[PDB]
Amino acid sequence: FLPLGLKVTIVGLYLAVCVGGLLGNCLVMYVILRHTKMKTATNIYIFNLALADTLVLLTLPFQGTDILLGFWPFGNALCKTVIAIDYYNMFTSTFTLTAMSVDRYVAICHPRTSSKAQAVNVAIWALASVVGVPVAIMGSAQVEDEEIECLVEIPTPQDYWGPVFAICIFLFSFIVPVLVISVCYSLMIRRLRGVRLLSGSREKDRNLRRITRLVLVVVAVFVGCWTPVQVFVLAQGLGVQPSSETAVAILRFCTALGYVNSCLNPILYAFLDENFKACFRK
Numbered sequence: 346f347l348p349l350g351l352k353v354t355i356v357g358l359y360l361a362v363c364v365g366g367l368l369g370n371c372l373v374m375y376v377i378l379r380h381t382k383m384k385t386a387t388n389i390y391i392f393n394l395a396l397a398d399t400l401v402l403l404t405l406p407f408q409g410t411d412i413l414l415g416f417w418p419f420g421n422a423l424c425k426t427v428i429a430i431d432y433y434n435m436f437t438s439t440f441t442l443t444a445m446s447v448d449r450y451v452a453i454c455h456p457r458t459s460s461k462a463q464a465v466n467v468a469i470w471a472l473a474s475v476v477g478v479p480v481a482i483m484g485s486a487q488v489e490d491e492e493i494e495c496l497v498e499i500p501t502p503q504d505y506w507g508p509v510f511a512i513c514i515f516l517f518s519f520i521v522p523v524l525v526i527s528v529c530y531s532l533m534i535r536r537l538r539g540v541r542l543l544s545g546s547r548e549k550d551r552n553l554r555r556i557t558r559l560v561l562v563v564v565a566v567f568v569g570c571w572t573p574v575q576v577f578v579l580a581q582g583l584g585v586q587p588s589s590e591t592a593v594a595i596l597r598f599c600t601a602l603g604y605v606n607s608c609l610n611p612i613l614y615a616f617l618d619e620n621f622k623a624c625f626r627k
């Protein structure tokens with residue numbers, strides 16, 4: 346369980362993340378859409394990111410009420426919606442980041458149309474649907490111990506399907522996506538050795554370098570925010586359950602950290618992207 350002070354602290358953090366995150370993300374989407382022609386492929390992917398982040402941020406009020414009350418009072422439909430938005434958020438985020446890194450390597454190695462990027466976004470959501478619809482069906486509000494909870498139900502026997510879904514989710518929603526990114530940036534590093542002012546026009550080269558560092562930083566913040574949760578949930582699938590109060594606290598705060606990422610992303614755009622930093626003020 347959790348003390349009420351820790352609960353009010355967590356849910357307060359959720360409120361701040363929700364307001365600032367929705368404001369910033371809606372501002373980013375509004376920028377790329379109705380304030381300019383910033384429709385570069387990178388910004389199309391960024392738009393996808395801000396979209397998923399928007400959706401999960403909407404779930405935070407309900408997760409917070411749930412954390413306060415200790416149970417899920419909204420029924421099945423909102424529970425399925427929340428779970429689906431959750432998995433959709435993870436998979437869409439990692440896949441979009443992967444597409445961003447691949448696009449970066451395409452630009453560095455082969456010196457990309459916004460519409461192609463939009464098609465990539467469609468495919469990203471398609472795979473994210475391959476995972477996201479099943480959990481939306483299996484997700485349910487179950488009175489496990491005479492109390493209502495919101496979870497995905499592992500098929501019987503749970504001691505087998507638990508690990509299968511655990512390691513599969515861990516690999517294909519995190520490790521394999523992260524690994525492709527690592528490959529892309531490693532190939533880019535090998536490419537740029539002994540190359541000064543190469544790849545065409547010096548000024549545009551600078552621009553490319555700025556975008557590359559932006560993508561890398563966003564990826565680094567994402568991974569750094571979600572790695573504890575990914576590891577802990579992997580341990581959860583193996584049956585390793587937290588029974589201490591402080592254990593529950595650490596776990597809750599790690600999830601909170603991931604949602605902090607969900608509000609973190611526009612700030613990174615404001616400090617690391619010139620067009621966003623200028624456009625934010627105007």
Ligand SMILES: Cc1cccc2c1CC[C@H](CN1CCC(c3c(Cl)cccc3Cl)CC1)C[C@@H]2O
Nearest residue numbers: 408411412428431432435495514518574575578
């Ligand atoms: C408070 C509350 C109320 C209703 C539902 C839930 C939660 C808690 C957070 C959890 C947060 N989830 C965050 C994402 C996490 C995860 C996912 Cl969806 C996919 C791959 C790896 C991980 Cl670590 C699985 C846990 C979701 C849950 O459905």
